Amino acid sequence: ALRIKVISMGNAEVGKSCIIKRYCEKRFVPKYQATIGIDYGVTKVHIKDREIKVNIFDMAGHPFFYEVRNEFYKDTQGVILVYDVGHKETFESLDGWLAEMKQELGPQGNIDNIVFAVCANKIDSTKHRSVDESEGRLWSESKGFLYFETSAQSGEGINEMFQAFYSAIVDLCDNGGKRPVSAINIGFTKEQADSIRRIRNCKDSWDMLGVKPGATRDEVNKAYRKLAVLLHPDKCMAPGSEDAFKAVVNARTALLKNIKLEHHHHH
Ligand SMILES: Nc1nc2c(ncn2[C@@H]2O[C@H](COP(=O)(O)OP(=O)(O)OP(=O)(O)O)[C@@H](O)[C@H]2O)c(=O)[nH]1
Numbered sequence: 001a002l003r004i005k006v007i008s009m010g011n012a013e014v015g016k017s018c019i020i021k022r023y024c025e026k027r028f029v030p031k032y033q034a035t036i037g038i039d040y041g042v043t044k045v046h047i048k049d050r051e052i053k054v055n056i057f058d059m060a061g062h063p064f065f066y067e068v069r070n071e072f073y074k075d076t077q078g079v080i081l082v083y084d085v086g087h088k089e090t091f092e093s094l095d096g097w098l099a100e101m102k103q104e105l106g107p108q109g110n111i112d113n114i115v116f117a118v119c120a121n122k123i124d125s126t127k128h129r130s131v132d133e134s135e136g137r138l139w140s141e142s143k144g145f146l147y148f149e150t151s152a153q154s155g156e157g158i159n160e161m162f163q164a165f166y167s168a169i170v171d172l173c174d175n176g177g178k179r180p181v182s183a184i185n186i187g188f189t190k191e192q193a194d195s196i197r198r199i200r201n202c203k204d205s206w207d208m209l210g211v212k213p214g215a216t217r218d219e220v221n222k223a224y225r226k227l228a229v230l231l232h233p234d235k236c237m238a239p240g241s242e243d244a245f246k247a248v249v250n251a252r253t254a255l256l257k258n259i260k261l262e263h264h265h266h267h
């Protein structure tokens with residue numbers, strides 16, 4: 001039986017609690033009760049035919065609770081990221097939510113092994129709609145997130161979002177908690193293809209990472225990591241990316257070896 005952790009993020013009054021209670025407790029009330037810091041609960045779901053025990057940390061969206069929320073970003077498998085189509089400041093704030101999560105995970109952190117369901121919520125409201133499906137779908141899908149139009153009041157989109165959410169999370173768990181490689185684009189970036197070819201026909205390790213002689217260890221480190229995320233054969237399906245990755249790895253150590261050796265014979 002699978003044990004996972006789900007959190008909710010997004011501005012106050014956006015509907016995080018009511019999305020969760022609509023699907024898990026089959027209930028909805030119009031009366032607002034702001035989450036105070038964080039609400040913890042356990043629910044059980046059966047998706048695929050894996051039995052999933054879901055630890056939910058429903059977070060409070062008000063900024064006053066910044067310090068309360070920071071403890072609960074680590075070891076997260078799924079995120080319910082919510083805004084209100086009727087209030088565009090909640091959609092714009094979503095970059096800040098990603099930033100806040102990304103720092104509580106440190107530089108190790110790869111939100112790419114986390115499933116995100118973006119919920120454009122309250123589509124049922126008569127009120128003037130200020131965020132359109134194009135804009136939210138583009139912001140979400142361009143980041144590898146799922147996107148759904150939802151209403152906790154009507155139920156629209158709720159069951160479909162949660163079914164897609166938990167299936168992506170089951171797929172993530174069956175792959176060791178690493179983002180599953182999707183057949184829907186075993187293609188590859190153009191800059192990926194350029195970097196692989198530029199790395200074949202390169203005979204110098206300075207130019208292989210894009211740095212000139214006399215570079216800090218910290219600069220060759222930071223050149224290396226941007227190529228590593230670009231070219232790792234797990235992430236990049238282009239032919240020859242494994243050899244390009246190996247070449248980048250070996251170049252980094254060639255430079256790091258001579259840097260520290262020139263620091264030891266000089267100063
Ligand atoms: N019309 C409409 N109202 C909604 C919908 N979802 C939530 N609400 C209302 O919006 C208010 C806020 O909903 P919550 O779920 O408590 O919002 P929240 O994101 O949990 O807010 P905080 O916990 O304070 O961050 C409540 O009054 C809900 O009734 C919706 O889909 N449609």
Ligand SMILES: [Mg+2]
Pocket residue numbers: 016017018033034035058059060061
């Ligand atoms: Mg809440």
